[PDB]
Design a protein around this ligand. Structure first.
Ligand SMILES: *C(=O)[C@@H](NC(=O)Cc1ccccc1)[C@@H]1N[C@@H](C(=O)O)C(C)(C)S1
Length: 263
């Protein structure tokens, strides 16, 4: 609905920055609405969903185990590791790391997992293999959040990310059990409150992943829908704003309000 695009443009005005947006039909893959669908934006923490998808693919293939324990030390800790920080002693399982990476956006968890699969080059290779020739991971946390203007590193495009998410959640890529696990992690996201969740009506379903980075970078990927089932994928990215975190959250939430209103 174009009324939503009105809000997206308004957000651009308010934030004084580019906003990338896409509304995708989960079932058919049809693009319902878009704004800057093919411009690059830093993925930030949204990459974690793809990372865990790759992990799950290995689990499916027998090359990885969810129960496998990973040990790390103070040395591996990076900024913002609320979960990993508390488990230095006993370590954490792959499953727990994906949970922390997705639900709490634990940066260290993500790094550990990245290493585990072979690094950014491998995640990228994984995406390429699934038909995503746009999305690329080049660095680890925290560098991947630099958001240097015009830098293609660690970026995606709203249309690419939407499409990839659709494949991950509904394609034959992962086994059903792994698909569900991924969705369950995204549904349990605990740090995305002020975003789309704030505009979500009761009884609706939401599986998401937020992210923030330098240079006013903020974004969210989500699968949502009424009556406890997802039916659309929404991707929203922004970068370049000088606005405060709260200002950025509000705009994203208002975008969500509009998309819900015009459902
Ligand atoms: C992913 O996007 C992570 N972001 C940061 O570590 C980058 C950052 C944030 C603020 C200032 C400077 C750099 C984790 N993702 C977000 C998100 O999910 O909202 C957090 C803020 C939780 S950290």
């Amino acid at each position: 609905h174009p009324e939503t695009l009105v809000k997206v443009k308004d957000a651009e005005d308010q934030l004084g920055a580019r906003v990338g947006y896409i509304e995708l039909d989960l079932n058919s893959g049809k693009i319902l609405e878009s704004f800057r669908p093919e411009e690059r934006f830093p993925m930030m923490s949204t990459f974690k969903v793809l990372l865990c998808g790759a992990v799950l693919s290995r689990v499916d293939a027998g090359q990885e185990q969810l129960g496998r324990r990973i040990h790390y030390s103070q040395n591996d800790l990076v900024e913002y590791s609320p979960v990993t920080e508390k488990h230095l002693t006993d370590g954490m399982t792959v499953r727990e790391l994906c949970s922390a990476a997705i639900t709490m956006s634990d940066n260290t968890a993500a790094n550990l997992l990245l290493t585990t699969i072979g690094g950014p080059k491998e995640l990228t290779a994984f995406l390429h293999n699934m038909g995503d020739h746009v999305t690329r991971l080049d660095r680890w946390n925290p560098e991947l959040n630099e958001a240097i203007p015009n830098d293609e590193r660690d970026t995606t495009m709203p249309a690419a990310m939407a499409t990839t998410l659709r494949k991950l959640l509904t394609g034959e890529l992962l086994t059903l059990a792994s698909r569900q696990q991924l969705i369950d992690w995204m549904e349990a996201d605990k740090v995305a409150g002020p975003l789309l969740r704030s505009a979500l009506p009761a009884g609706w379903f939401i599986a998401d992943k937020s992210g923030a980075g330098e240079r006013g970078s903020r974004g969210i990927i989500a699968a949502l829908g009424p009556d406890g089932k997802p039916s659309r994928i929404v991707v929203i990215y922004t970068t370049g704003s000088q606005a405060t975190m709260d200002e950025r959250n509000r705009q994203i939430a208002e975008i969500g309000a509009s998309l819900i209103k015009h459902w």
